[PDB]
Amino acid sequence: AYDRAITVFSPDGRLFQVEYAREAVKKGSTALGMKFANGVLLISDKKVRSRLIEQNSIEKIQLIDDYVAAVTSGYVADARVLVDFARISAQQEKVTYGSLVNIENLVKRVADQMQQYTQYGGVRPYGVSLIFAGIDQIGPRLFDCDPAGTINEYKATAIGSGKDAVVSFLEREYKENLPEKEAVTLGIKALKSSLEEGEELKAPEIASITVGNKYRIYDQEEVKKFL
Amino acid sequence: AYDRAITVFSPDGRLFQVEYAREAVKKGSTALGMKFANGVLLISDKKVRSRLIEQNSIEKIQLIDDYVAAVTSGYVADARVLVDFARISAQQEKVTYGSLVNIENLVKRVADQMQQYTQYGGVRPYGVSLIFAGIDQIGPRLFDCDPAGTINEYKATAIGSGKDAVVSFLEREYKENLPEKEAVTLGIKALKSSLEEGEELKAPEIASITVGNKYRIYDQEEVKKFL
Amino acid sequence: AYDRAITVFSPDGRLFQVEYAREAVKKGSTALGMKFANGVLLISDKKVRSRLIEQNSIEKIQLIDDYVAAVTSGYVADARVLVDFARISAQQEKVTYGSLVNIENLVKRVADQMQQYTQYGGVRPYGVSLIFAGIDQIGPRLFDCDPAGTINEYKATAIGSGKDAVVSFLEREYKENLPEKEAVTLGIKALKSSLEEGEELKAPEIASITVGNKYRIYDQEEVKKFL
Amino acid sequence: AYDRAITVFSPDGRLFQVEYAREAVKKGSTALGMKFANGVLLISDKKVRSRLIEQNSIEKIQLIDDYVAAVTSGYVADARVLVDFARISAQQEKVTYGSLVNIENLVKRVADQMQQYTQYGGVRPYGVSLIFAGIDQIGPRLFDCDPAGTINEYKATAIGSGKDAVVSFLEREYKENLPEKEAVTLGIKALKSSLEEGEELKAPEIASITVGNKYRIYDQEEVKKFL
Amino acid sequence: AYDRAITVFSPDGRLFQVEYAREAVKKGSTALGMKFANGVLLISDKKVRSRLIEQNSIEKIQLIDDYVAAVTSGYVADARVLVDFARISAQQEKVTYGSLVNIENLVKRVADQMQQYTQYGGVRPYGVSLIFAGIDQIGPRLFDCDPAGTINEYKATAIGSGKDAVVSFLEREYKENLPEKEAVTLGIKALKSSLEEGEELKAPEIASITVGNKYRIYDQEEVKKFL
Amino acid sequence: AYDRAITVFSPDGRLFQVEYAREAVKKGSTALGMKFANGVLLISDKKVRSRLIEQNSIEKIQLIDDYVAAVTSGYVADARVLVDFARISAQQEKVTYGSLVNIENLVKRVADQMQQYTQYGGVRPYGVSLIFAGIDQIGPRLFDCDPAGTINEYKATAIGSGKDAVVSFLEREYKENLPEKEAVTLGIKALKSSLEEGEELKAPEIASITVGNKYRIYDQEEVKKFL
Amino acid sequence: AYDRAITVFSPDGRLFQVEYAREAVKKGSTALGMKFANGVLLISDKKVRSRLIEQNSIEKIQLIDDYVAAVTSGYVADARVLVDFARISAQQEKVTYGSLVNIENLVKRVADQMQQYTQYGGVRPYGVSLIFAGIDQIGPRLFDCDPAGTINEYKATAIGSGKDAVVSFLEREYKENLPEKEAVTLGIKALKSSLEEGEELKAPEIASITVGNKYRIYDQEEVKKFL
Amino acid sequence: TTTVGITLKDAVIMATERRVTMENFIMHKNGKKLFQIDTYTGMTIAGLVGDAQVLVRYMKAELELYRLQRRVNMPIEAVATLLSNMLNQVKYMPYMVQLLVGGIDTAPHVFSIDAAGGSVEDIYASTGSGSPFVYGVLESQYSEKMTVDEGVDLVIRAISAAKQRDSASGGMIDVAVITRKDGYVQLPTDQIESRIRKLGLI
Amino acid sequence: TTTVGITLKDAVIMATERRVTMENFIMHKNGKKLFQIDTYTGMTIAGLVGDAQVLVRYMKAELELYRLQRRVNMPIEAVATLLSNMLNQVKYMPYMVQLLVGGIDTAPHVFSIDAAGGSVEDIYASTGSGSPFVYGVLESQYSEKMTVDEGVDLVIRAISAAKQRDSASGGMIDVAVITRKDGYVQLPTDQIESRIRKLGLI
C-alpha cells in the first residue's frame, strides 16, 4: 500500500516508513538532557541484563569532541553509524575554519544525512533519535534529532520509551539557571518517575559541561551519591 | 494503482503522489505575505507547544540573502533542504554576475529542482510550499512555490492550513500601496481570522523590506504592539 | 495491467501512459495560432482567478528567441522545463552555425526529448502540448508538439481544453493571406466561440511577427480595442 | 503474466510486447515499394485530415542520403528517431570508407538497434516498420524492417494497415523489369485496391531512383497525371 | 511464479525462461550437419513463402571466416547478433595469435555470452540454436550451441523443428568416412524424411569444406542434381 | 508484507529480514568464550558427521592476527567472508599506525560492514554471529557481533544453538580471575551442559592467550585430558 | 513468497533459491574422488546417449593446472564458467608468488565467487557442485564446493545424483593409504553400486596424481581393464 | 590592431580599425573587430582572431538568454564580470585576447578585460599594438565635457595617429555610438569619410 | 602548394596546383587539393595532407546531413563558422592546415580560415607557400568587373607566376567555377591547357 518503501506519500500525506521508524525509537533506552546555569548536562539510563556483561562498554554518552556530547535511542547499530558521521563532520569544520562556532550547524549536517534516507528509494530511514548538547560561541546548546530529520532546541528534553514520563515531569518541575548539583538532582528524580511501578533506579551515566571548561564524565561513585 | 510512484499518469491525467504531497502542505503552519507601498512583508504564525522549547529556533522566516526572505509550510526537514538550496543558488548568481537582478529566476531554479522530483522515478516529491519576497532591480516581488513546482506572482498570498481563511480575508480587505504600519495591521487581522474559534493569536514573526534598505526582522516587543 | 509504466505495449498496441498524459493536456488553458499575410500570430486565453495575483507573470507566450515564440498547455511546471530546453537548444544552434535557418529542426529537438521519456523506463512522459511559431529562412512557420512527440505544420491550430471548439471554427472561417488586423479579429472570434455559455472573454495576450521584423507583444490597450 | 516487459518468454516461446508492438504497426499509414528495370520506387499514401494542415510536412519518404530513401509506418515519433539514427549511421560509413558499398549493412545497423530494445529490460520496443530502397554497388535494393528486427529483401513489398491488400495484389500482378512509367502505374493500382470501399485515392508521394542517377521526388503535378 | 525472469530457480531446479527459449527454437527452420571423410558439411532447409522475396538473402549458412561456417535456428534477429559476435571474436583471435588453432574455443566464447544472459537479471536469454562446423589444427569439427549455452561435439547433428526426425534418421543410417558425394546424398534423404507428409523438398543450401581447402558453397544447379 | 526486503520497517518497528537472519544463527554450532586471570579463551564445539572428513579443516577458531582470534556461527560461507574482511582490516591498521591498540575498533569496522547490509536495498544481511577475543593495549577483551551489527563486551558469552544453555550455566557458575586450567575446565562443563540428553561431548578446540604472549591452540591430546 | 530472489530470508532462516539450486545438482552426473597412498584420484561417470556424439568432448575431469584437477555436476554451462574462473585464478597466484602453495586458497576464491551470487540481488546462484583434487606443498588434497559456497576436506567424497549411494559405500568399505591400483578398483565398485538396477557400468574417466609427478589421465584401454 | 572606447555624459563611443595580419603580411584589409552584443552593449577584440570570434559568439548567446529569462538587459558590470570568470577559469590554457566592453545600463561604462580575467572600469581605454599612440592623443585632448560629435572626431584622430605609426594597424575606421535614446548606432562609412576630410587626416 | 579563390558578380572561381611533397622531394605530381563539398560550395586545402583530407571528409558528411534535415543548403558563412568552431576547439592540438571556402548561397563569398579557427571574408584570397606571388598578380590585375572568362585567365596567370618562383608548387592547374545557373563545374583539363597556350604561359 503506502507503508512499504519511502518515496510513497499516503493519500492524507504521511510517510508510514518514517512513522514506523519512530516506533523503533519508542523501544530504546530512556535518556534526557537539561540546561542549567552556564552549562548543560546529559543523563542516560543504564539497566543491567546480566552479570556477564563488562560494565564500561555501556557508554551511552558519546563525545563528538571535547565540547559536544550526544546520546542516542533506538537501533544501536544505526546510532553508532550516525555518531561516527558526526565525529568526522565535526573534525572537517575544525580543519576548514580552525574552530567550531555553532553546534546547530553540526546537528543540521547530521539531520540532512537522515533526511536523504527518507526521500531516495533503495534505502530505509535511520531508526535513531539523538540529543546533542555542548558549548559553542553562542553558549550552552541542547538539540534533538528524529528519524525524519526534525531539529528543535530545548531547555530540557528526553528521548526513548520513557520520554513522555520524563517530559511531563520536566513540564511541571523544571526551572532555569539552576546549580549543577540541583539540576542533576532534578534529572535523577525525573528519570526515576518513569521506571515501571516496582523497578528501582540503577546507577546511570551523567555528563555535564560548563562554559570555559570541557566535558566531564561523572565517576560511578559521584553518580552513586545522587540516588 | 496510479497513486504509488510518480511516473504514472492517472487515466484522467493527474499525479496522485503530487496531490498527496499537497495534503502534507495543508497540515503545516499558516503564513502569509503582502505587498505595500515600496515594500513587501512576511508574516508567519508561531504557536507554542511547550514551555521547554527555546523560543528563537522557531525562526519561520529564513533570509536567503540580505534582500530575499522565504517562509515554508509542510515537512520542516524537506523545507530546510530547499532553503539551503536557495541560499547556495543565490550566491552562485552573485559570483557569476556580481549581483542578483531578478528574484523570479532564483525562484525558478528552486521550482525546477522540485519539478524533477515529480518526473524521475526512485524519489518522492518535496512536501513543501514556499513564499518568496524581496527587492530586486525591478522592484518588490512576491512569489509562491508548490510541491509540483507551480510559480505565481501575487500582491498578497498565504500558505498552510489557514490558507483559505487568510486568502478569503485578503480577497475582501486588501488594498494596494498601503503604509507599512497599516499593512502589518491588516496582516495580523487576516491571520487572526483563521484561528480555530476560541484560540487566541500568539506573538508571530514579521519581516519587512523597503526599496533601498535591507530586510528588517521585527523585535518581539514591536510585534507585541500590533495585537 | 498495461497502464502503469511506459515500456509496456497494450495488446492492441497503445501506450496508455502517453494517452493519460493527453488527458492532462485537455485540462490546460486554450491557445491558438494562425498564419496570415507574411506573418504568424499567437493568441492565448488568460482567465483571472483572484485579484491578488500580479497580472504580468501570466505570460503565456514565451519567446524562444527574438524570432521564435511558443505557447504551452497542460502542467505548467513540465512546460517551463521544456521552454528552457528550447531556449538553450536555440542558442546552441546559433553558436555552432552563426544563425538559425529552420525552426522545424528546433521543434524536432524538443520533440526528440519528449519521445525518449515515453520509451525509457524510470520516467513519466511530459504532460505538455506546445505550439511553435516564428520566421526562419523559408518563411513563417507554425508547429505543434504533443506529449508523445508528434509534429505537424499548420496554417492554423489550437491546443487546450477548447481546442475542438477553436479548430472547428477555423475549419469553417479561416482564410489565407489575411491582414494582421483581420487575422487577429478572426482569432478573437474563434477563441470567444469556446467560452462556456455565459462566460465573457477577458483580455488575452496576442503576439505577432512579420517577415523582416522581430516579435511584437500586444500592449493591454491594443488588445482591448479588439474585443 | 508474460505480456508486460520484454525479457520474459511466454511458455510457448513468444515475446508478447514485440507482438503488441506489431499491432501498433497495423494502425499506421500504408506504403509500398517495387523493383523495376534498373531501379526501385517508393509509394506512400497521404490522406488529408483537415485543410488547416500545411501540405509539405506530410513528407512520408525520407532520404537517408542522395541514393537511399526510407518510408515508415506506426508511431511517427519512434519512426523519426530511427530515421535520424539511419542518417547518422550512413554518414559514419562514408567518413570511414569514403563511400557506401552495401545498403544491407546500413539496414542491419538499424535492425540491431531495434533488436537490443527487445532484449534489455527498462525499455520498450520501437513500434515502427520500415522499408529501405536505393542503389548500391551491387544494384537496386529493397528491404523491410520490423519491430523485432527481422530483415528481408523483396522485389515488391508493403507495410501498414493495407499491407495485406497491397501484397495480395502484387502477389498476382507484379512483373519484373518493368519500365518506370508502368511500375508506378501498377503501384497506384495496388494501393487503390486497399482503400475502404467508397474512399477515393488522394495524391500520394512517389520517389524513384535509377542506376547512375540520384533519387527523384515526383512533383505533385506529375503524381496527378497517374490517377 | 518461477517462470518470469531468469535468476529464479524452480523448486525442483529448472530455469523456466531458459526452457521457454527452447520452445522458440522448436519453431525455427530445420538444419543439419554431418562429418565425412576429411571434411564436414552443412545443410539447411530453405522453404519459399512468396515469389516476391529475393532468393539470395535467404542465406542460412553464415561464414564466420574462410574456414568456419554456422547455421542458426529460432529468432533470426537474435541469431544475427550472435553471428556478428562470433565473427568479431574470430578476428580478435587472429589478431592476437596470428591464427585460429581450435574452433572449440571460438564456440565456447559464444556459449559464454549466452550463458551470462541466463544468470544476470534485466535481460532475456537468446532464443537461438547454433551449429558450428569447420577445419582447425586438430581436424574437422562439428559443434552445437543451445540457448542455455550447452556445447557438444558430434559426428552428425540437427537443429530446428525437424530435429527429432533428422536425428532419428541419422541414428540409423549414418556412416563415418563417407565420400562428400555420398554424405550429401544421405543428408538430403535425412532432411526429406522430416517434411510433413505431402510437402515436397525444395532446393536447399549445402556448404562443405575439406582439409587443406576453404569453404565451398554449392551452386543452385549443383544442389539441384542431388534431389 | 514487511518480511521480504530490508528497507522496510514493520508497523511496530522491526526488521523481519534481520530477525530471520537471527534464526539462521540459532542453527549454527555452539561456541563460547570466557575471561580469566590475565587472559581470555575460546571454546568451540566440533561434532563429527562422517569418518570421511579430514579432521583439521574443521578449524572453528580463526586467528585474525597473532593476538586476536574469532569464532563464528551460522552460514559458514558468509562467516568466511567476514573473517577475511577482519584480517584485511587488521593489517590496514598495522600499516597505518604501526600497531593495533584497541580490538574494539576492529570489531566496530566488522559491525559497520554488516550494518550497511541491513539498510541498503539489493542485498541480504549476513547470517553470522561472531565472538572476538584477544589482547590489546588496554588488556584482555571479549566481544560479540550479531547479524544486525550489535556489539557488546563480556566477561563470558556464547553463540549458536546451545547459547541459552551455556549462558545460563555461566550465569550461575562463572567466576572472575580464574587460572587458565580452571577456566578451561569450567568451559568444558558449560558446553557439556548443552548436549541433547544422551549425546556425549567430543574433543573440541580450545584457544587461549595471556598478556605478553601470543595465541596458543590446544593440541588434541591436551584437549583430551580435560574431558 | 521467500522462494523467488536471493536477498530474502525465510521466516525459519533458509535461502530457498540456494536450496532450489541444490536440486539442480541432484540431476547431474555422478562423480567421486578418493585419497590413497601418496596420491588422490578422480572418477567421473560417462554415459552415452547417442552414437552420433564424438567421444572426447565428454571430458568430465578438467585440469586447472598440471597439478590440480576438478570435476563438476549440475548445469554444464555454469560449470564451464566456474572452471575458467579457477584456471585464471590459479595463474594469477603463480604470477604473483611464482608458485601455488595451498590448493585450499584456490578453492576458497572459487567459493567466494559463488557466495556473492547468493547475497547480491539481480543474479541467480550457480547450480554447480565441484570437487577439487591435487598435490600442493602440504600434500594430497581433496575438496568439495556447493552452490552456497560451503567447503569441506575429505578422504573420499562424491557428487551428483548417485552421491548418496557412493558415499554410503565409501562409508563402509573405504580404507586409507591404499595402492593406486586398489583405490581405483574400490572406486569403480563404489560407482557401480549406484547404477539403477539393470543398467551396466560404461567406461568412465579416471585421473590420478602422485607426489612428485603430474596428473595422469587414464587411457581408455587402461580404464577397460578395471571393469 | 587598434581599438578605443570612451565615455561621455550620456554616450559611449567605440572605434576600431580593420587591418588583419594572418600568416604574417597584410592578408585582409577589411576585417571586423567591433561587434554589437546587446541592445546597448558593444565589444571590441584584439589578439588572436580565432579565440576572439569564439568569445563574441559566446557573449551573444549568453546575453540574449539572460535577457529572455530576466526580462531585462544584463548590466554592463555584470557583462564584464561574466567575461572575467570565463577567462580566469582557463587561465593556464587561456584565450590570447584583450577585450573592451562598453554600454549604458543607467550610466555609460567602459570595461577593460585582459587574458587572465582582470576587469577594471575606466573613463576611456585602448587596446592593441597601436594603443600607446592612442593614449598619447587622449592624454592631451580628451575632456569629459565634449559633445557626441566632438567625441567622434577625437577617436577618429586618435586612430589616425596610430595608423601612421603602427604597421599592424590600418584600413577603414569603424565607429559605433551607444545612447539610451538611439540605442546601438553604427556610424555610416560615408559620414566617417566626410569627417576625416573635415578633420584634415587625409 | 598554391591555392586561390576569387569572387565575381555572380560567380566564384577557385584554382590550385597539384605538386605534393612527402618525405621531402617531389613524390607526387598530380595530387588533389580542390574539393567539392556541396552543391554550390568548394574548398581548397594547404598544409599537412593527413589533417586536410580528414577535414574534407568531415565537411562532406556534415553538409550533406545538414541538407537532409533542413531541406536547404548550408549558407557559406555557416560553413565557415562550423569550420571555425572545430579548429578552435582543438587549437592546442591543432590541424596544421590553411583553408579556403567559396560558394554562392545568394551572393558569392570566399572565406579564409586559419589553423586556430580565425575566419574572415574577402573578395579574393590565396594560401600556401606560393600565395605571396599570387597576391602580387592579383594586386595589380584583379578587377570586380571582369567576366567569368577573364577571371579564369587571371587565376591561371597568377598560379603560373607562383610555379615559376615557388619550388613547392608545380604540376597541372585545376580550376572550378561555381554559379547558381550551372552549379559546381570543374573546368576540363583540355580547356585549361588551351587557355595557357592562348595566354602565353607556355
Author numbering:
A (entry chain B), B (entry chain C), C (entry chain D), D (entry chain E), E (entry chain F), F (entry chain A), ...: 7 to 233
H (entry chain J), I (entry chain K): 1 to 202
Extract from the study:
Understanding the critical role of tyrosine in the HbYX motif, and recognizing the partial activation caused by the L81Y mutation—which was designed to mimic the tyrosine occupancy of HbYX, as identified in a concurrent study31—we moved forward with constructing a cryo-EM structure of T20S-αL81Y. Unlike the ZYA-T20S model, the conformational changes caused by L81Y were different and subtle. We did not observe a substantial α-ring rotation or a conformational change at the loop proximal to K66; however, we did observe a slight rise of Helix 0 in a direction parallel with the sevenfold axis mostly clearly seen in Fig. 5b. The T20S-αL81Y model shows that the hydroxyl group of tyrosine is within proximity to hydrogen bond with the backbone of G19, similar to ZYA’s tyrosine. Additionally, we noted that tyrosine hydrogen bonded with a water molecule that is also hydrogen bonding to the backbone of L21 but not the side chain of E25. We also noted the water which hydrogen bonds with the backbone of A30 is not displaced by L81Y, reinforcing the point that L81Y is not oriented like ZYA’s tyrosine. This structure suggests that the tyrosine interactions with G19 and L21 are sufficient to cause a Helix 0 shift upward, which consequently partially opens the gate. Therefore, the L81Y tyrosine by itself cannot fully mimic the ZYA-bound open state.
The ubiquitin-proteasome system (UPS) is a crucial regulatory pathway responsible for eliminating damaged or unnecessary proteins within cells. Central to this system is the proteasome, a molecular machine that selectively degrades proteins. A hydrophobic-tyrosine-any residue (HbYX) motif on the C-termini of proteasome-activating complexes independently triggers gate-opening of the 20S core particle for protein degradation; however, the causal allosteric mechanism remains unclear. The architecture of the archaeal 20S proteasome is conserved resembling the eukaryotic 20S, but its α and β rings are homoheptameric rather than heteroheptameric.
